[PDB]
Symmetry: D2
Subunit: 329 residues, 4 copies
């Protein structure tokens, strides 16, 4: 394959570090070696995260197209939209965000802290709710040229490129470390994060080692999205193989009870990981993927000796919209 053909606009500090999770690994049995690749610390643009890695491959097209406004969408505590707002500010672009009520969660400061708060400070036009088209049209009619960024950046032709690059990065780091990771655990919702990974790791025969953990609570849709995006992306980068259902692993046991709502396992997972490693995760995405990984290790689902690379996608600021749940820890 060949990713290098597509330009990448630097929005990150560079390759993201991989850290050992020795305390947590030991706590769980010392049988499985856990690591974490910090996508959550990839940028100076309002905390970045996985969405920011994706955006690097989309910005060039926005610039090439002479666009002046970035328009995106997501739930109230969307990480995607907060990142688009920061990238836009940094690029000197206007920003219009469509924020919808995507979660059955009632919290007094939900639309005023965390991710959405930053987007407003960053100068984005935050619209709280077809709304998609309206917003875009709004921009054209306003005299500007919008660059449409779908939810999570996922269902877009360039949306899968960022994480194919992730697999690339990991290969280079395994070469520096002198060892390979047996698996990768990643949280999945809109899909192009895992899709990129699947294509990237299909290259060296480990697509099936990319263990996705669903956090959408609609596993069938998410799995089809990932699969579809992986196929389109595999074509885009010249993978010399088709993606098979066997290449898309999506665990469904940890997404409940709903998207945006933690279960008690989620909370326990967030607490354990934070208290053993000092590494925070959130109740919507990462805490669920962290939950899955801990559970898998606990159930012995990982062969003894396995090295598991947890991909920390970001999302911590959303913790602010769930303050009551953590009031005592």
């Amino acid at each position: 394959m060949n990713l290098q053909r597509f330009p990448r606009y630097p929005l990150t500090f560079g390759p993201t570090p991989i850290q050992p999770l020795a305390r947590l690994s030991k706590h769980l049995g010392g049988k499985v070696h856990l690591y974490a690749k910090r996508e959550d610390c990839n940028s100076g643009l309002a905390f970045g995260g996985n969405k920011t890695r994706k955006l690097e491959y989309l910005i060039p097209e926005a610039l090439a197209q002479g666009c002046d406004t970035l328009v995106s969408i997501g739930g109230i505590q969307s990480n995607q939209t907060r990142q688009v707002a920061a990238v836009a500010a940094h690029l000197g672009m206007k920003c219009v965000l469509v924020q919808e009520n995507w979660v059955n969660y009632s919290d007094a400061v939900y639309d005023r802290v965390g991710n959405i708060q930053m987007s407003r400070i960053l100068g984005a036009d935050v619209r709280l709710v077809r709304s998609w088209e309206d917003a875009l049209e709004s921009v054209r009619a306003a005299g500007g040229k919008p660059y449409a960024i779908p939810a999570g950046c996922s269902d877009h032709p360039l949306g899968g490129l960022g994480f194919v690059g992730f697999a690339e990065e990991v290969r280079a780091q395994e070469a520096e470390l002198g060892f390979k990771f047996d698996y990768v655990v990643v949280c999945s919702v809109t899909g192009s994060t895992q899709a990129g990974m699947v294509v990237g790791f299909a290259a060296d025969g480990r697509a099936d080692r990319v263990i996705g953990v669903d956090a959408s609570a609609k596993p069938a849709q998410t799995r089809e999205q990932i699969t579809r995006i992986a196929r389109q992306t595999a074509e885009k980068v010249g993978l010399e193989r088709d993606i098979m259902r066997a290449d898309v692993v999506l665990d469904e046991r940890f997404a409940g009870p709903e998207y945006g709502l933690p279960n008690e396992g989620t909370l326990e997972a967030i607490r354990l990981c934070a208290r053993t490693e000092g590494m925070l995760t959130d109740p919507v995405y990462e805490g669920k993927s962290m939950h899955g990984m801990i559970e898998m290790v606990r159930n012995g689902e990982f062969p003894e000796g396995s090295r598991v690379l947890y991909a920390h996608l970001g999302g911590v600021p959303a913790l602010n919209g769930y303050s009551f749940i953590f009031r005592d820890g």
Copy 2:
């Protein structure tokens, strides 16, 4: 000098990047070149920030002395205590935090979002003073069978609390080497003081101590200024500074600290917005927004020599934004 004599426990990713703030520089007239060194992105331990750089030089002693608990203190939205809680969890140590109402602010979720929320999740025993806390805290640890390592407010008034930022100057020299030039100034927010102190000592070396432009955020200029001065002299001695720190070496502008510690003024808010909107870089209403406000005003007043290169030290503090949600409800 020789900071190398003191061990440094790795708590950061490595040197912190310097980024140009061209959009903001141009916005202010394009006469002064603004940069930012990102201490606020130095670690994977609950966002880190300047305190985490300070802590790298304290943990070895704490470990050497066999302590099993880190004990610290600060206001409700203290960045310090949150970093202590994360560093403790990472090191396998317990943590006790004494949090006091240091600000005349009373937001509905002030004690449940941002920094303090993270400390609780990180497993610290977060103690809210009513409404000697410090001694009870330390003693409770002994009484329980542990050994506490005491970390004073901001890590500042501690024998080792000024080291972290001497190394910051060391870091900046090596980056200037690749940059092919030296920054004319450094802007840093100051409250407990060992951050600006370390910098004062670090830059005294190549005679730029008075180029480190401190911006007071304590709203108690005199005390803070005095503490920086003292911490500097002590640290200077600790590292072998072949020169002495003169009062003239400690620079602290007091025009941007109002109205009180922990409360922003309208300038602070505008500054936070201007910078976030021109660079995608956030600052808080208690600390960085005030030093950012200082720098912009300085540039605006033509107080920087045309052509000057100014290095803004972004110390962190962003999670505290969550405690001032009403002020930013519309931006």
Copy 3:
């Protein structure tokens, strides 16, 4: 029957007013006439409400016993504990409230606004436990009673909602009495929200006396109808006997509709919300997402479905609870 036998301490202004809900009645077609008996406005003690009417019959006992502390229990936005705190302060008694989140809900300011905020201002010792403590399991209720004694005082034990208490059903028997006296100026049905039960129970006993027990249409807000229904019946029978009601309470006398309790105790459904908004926008009368909004939703839905004979006059008992709206601010952010 004779309630006059049991002493009643004044904690209310006097009988509660009945007002017509003419606008809401008209909006629903005008075929049924709705009114409201404002139990929610019965007292100067921190907004009072139904619980305060119940307390009038318990306090004489607490006083005769020489108790100096009132001890009660309830969820975070419990109306009962807030009224106990004000009654206590008013009487010069101390107050301990054992509390815990009894709802699968987690609003940012849930434990610091509305009802619980007032209890703390009122001087009560609000003992709110962290999630997973489980007071009902550890029997924290008793330790609290014990700690008062252990401390030198004498506690008067007031159970959840005052209901499952010997004198807990008297207040609302008196309500039926008061209604009769006001009718001497008759309502066909009464709509009342039911959770812990002695409110509707007292009504059942009180109205059984003039043959209207089955005219009290209870609307479950517990989302545990079977338990609640049984509680109402039992409290009724005990209270009937207590007030010498020369009659047995039939299973037929206790009416508890289960259609508007969803999805859970303390959680409103879209129906609850529309009902709160409709009643508020037509009569200027506010109801809450936990209790009254569900019974308001009940009455409106019943009238809408024609379960009420044309021409019927329905007396909606507004038991109170409005302060709890403060804990559901996000839901009403745009109205």
Copy 4:
């Protein structure tokens, strides 16, 4: 005088009750007998309060004029705008409310709980920010006829009538009681509440017995508004005398530090009163007037044996916007 010349629209349950504050009185030495007149429990329309007594005299005119929309104004936690929204709903009229932040305060849920929450639920169109004028115009432009209701109902020709009636009510109740109150404590900010009282008690020679307690923190301006409204109202009811400045008593010692902000004395008084009587007061209005009365009795400013009638004007729902302050009581 002749108050009866004006039509009063019923919006209350009827005369408000007078309760003794026996415990608070004994607590402060029992040398002064304190009582409370509960204007705060005067209506089933969203808790009511003094504003509702004022409004009973303005509504007939709004109706007579055929207006279909009530338009008013106040700060975020304004009690007035909440009562206006409830009266509108009850009357079947539309409601437009201009809310501005009149307080240097910024609590996270300030514009979502208490009074303003009720107004939105009651169906008012709550517009947060020439303010006033724009609102009024927009209603006409929509094809409606708005009835303008100034802040607190105070600078309105009819705004002072409600409390002239309050004095009426009190003489009548004093008859039944068989005794007279020597003083009346009342919180004053916009002014027509105390002005109505001044006029109503001028009739029996007790105008200077109406002890006003400033809560505006701008006493000179408030003292002048009460004076003016009182004179204009006395003329409108045919008082057989002109109102003199000496008829207006306004203590300025308890308004600090600013309108909308409590001082430590305010909080203490709110707590003492709540804990001795079970009667709540707020940090903006009543707690300051409660603070005043207690301080007056404590300093021996009332003659031994005096009977003081505290007018509790309402305002308790605003407590919700000061939750941090009362988190532990």
